[PDB]
Paper text:
Undecaprenyl pyrophosphate synthase is a cis-prenyl transferase and is responsible for the condensation of eight molecules of IPP with farnesyl diphosphate to form the C55 species, undecaprenyl diphosphate. Following the condensation, undecaprenyl diphosphate is converted to Lipid I, Lipid II, and lastly, to bacterial cell wall peptidoglycans. The catalytic site is composed of four binding pockets, and it is responsible for accommodating the large substrates, FPP and IPP, and for transferring the phosphate groups and metal ions between the two substrates during the condensation reaction. Comparison of these crystal structures reveals that UPPS is a highly flexible protein system, showing very mobile binding pockets in the active site region.
In addition, we have crystallized E. coli UPPS with the flexible loop to further investigate the large pocket-size fluctuation in our MD simulations. To help confirm the nature of this pocket closure on ligand removal (or expansion on ligand binding), we crystallized the E. coli UPPS in the ligand-free form. Crystal structures of the ligand-bound and apo form of UPPS reveal that a major pocket closure occurs upon ligand removal, from 1032 to 432 Å3 and is in good agreement with the time-averaged pocket volume (332 Å3) of the apo form obtained from the MD simulation. We also described the first complete apo E. coli UPPS structure with an intact active site. We observed an excellent agreement between the calculated average pocket volume from the apo enzyme simulation and the newly solved crystal structure. Furthermore, it appears that the active site of the apo structure opens and expands considerably upon binding of bisphosphonate ligands, shifting the population of UPPS enzymes to a markedly different conformation. The most dynamic region of UPPS is the loop comprising residues 72–82.
Author numbering:
A (entry chain B): 13 to 72, 90 to 240
B (entry chain A): 17 to 239
Amino acid sequence: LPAHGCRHVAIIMDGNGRWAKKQGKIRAFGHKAGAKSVRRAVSFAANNGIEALTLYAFSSVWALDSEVKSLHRHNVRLRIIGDTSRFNSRLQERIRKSEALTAGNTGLTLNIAANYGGRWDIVQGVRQLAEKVQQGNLQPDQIDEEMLNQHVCMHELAPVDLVIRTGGEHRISNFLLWQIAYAELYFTDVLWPDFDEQDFEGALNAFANRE
Amino acid sequence: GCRHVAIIMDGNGRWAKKQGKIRAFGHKAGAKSVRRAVSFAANNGIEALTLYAFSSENWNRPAQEVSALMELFVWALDSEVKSLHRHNVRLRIIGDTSRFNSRLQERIRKSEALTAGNTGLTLNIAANYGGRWDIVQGVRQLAEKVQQGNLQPDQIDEEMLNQHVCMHELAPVDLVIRTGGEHRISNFLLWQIAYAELYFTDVLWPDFDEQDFEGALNAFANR
């Protein structure tokens, strides 16, 4: 266990539009600078002994194929969480191949939320339980919190210890809900493209000091 | 327009210790702070106030001990019901009261029925409540409907689950305040907080007053 105590960090990456606007640039430049900040955060987490990093791009992707070889070379295990059923069967395959490629990697596990909502996630788990009920396999009175826990996204990874939201808003915006029942919540006014290794270190040391 | 505010009322024990007093003194001051916050919300046109009976000192206690403390908390509210009712407040207890003693369960049901027709502030007191428990109680209901053959698994959506979790008749929660300095939800509302403003203050619950409540309402109006 590392000294900061944090096994799984989730981040609501907000502020790319506002970063671009401050500069008199269009939103697209913010999104490019935001991508650079993702690579930097991924590297920092891989180098500071974090088990899992889960990222939500908050709007206030086809990059996958462009970054996946780099992730694989950093020993990152990639996973997409979210409702990917309505992506075309072709995008679903390129997502599946990126997951398959990095599934044996032993470093950071990187979860990227894509068409994700915390309410959706709970409902999908409830549907898996209801199917087991309707098959006659599961009794309703056997359903408890631990059972539903074992049906939500990321249930097999360490619980989320710390949620960081950049960009100044103080809301979860239907990112993780069930999973953040006991997480430390850390809100910073730093905009996502500016959020660097020292800012990440600050959030981890804040978690260590407050835990 | 903050229509529904929820508050994690932490800090009563820490407050008593700073005052050089035993835990009970902090419970009593916490309860005074409840009366003041309910009054403030009713005077400021808030539609619904949801209060979570909570102490971080309880993290390291068995479920049965915690439930016992929650029965005491709810008993203490029994003497306040007549005045709430006169003030047109609708009182509801949310949470797992199934193993409360039967006389207290009957009093809870009586106080809820007495005030259920009231059209002023709705005051929810979350006793022996957890956000995961709340969701699972709603999931168990849907699972019974499936087993009975009255519901298809693929019919279950967010709207449907929403209708089976606490408070689905009231305005969405706009604002969650947590006093006492910790920055966590601690398994209060989960489903219902998806889009709420979260406001954390280091003020301990017994000290949280009308100016503090207005500060939180300002955070929300700005954001």
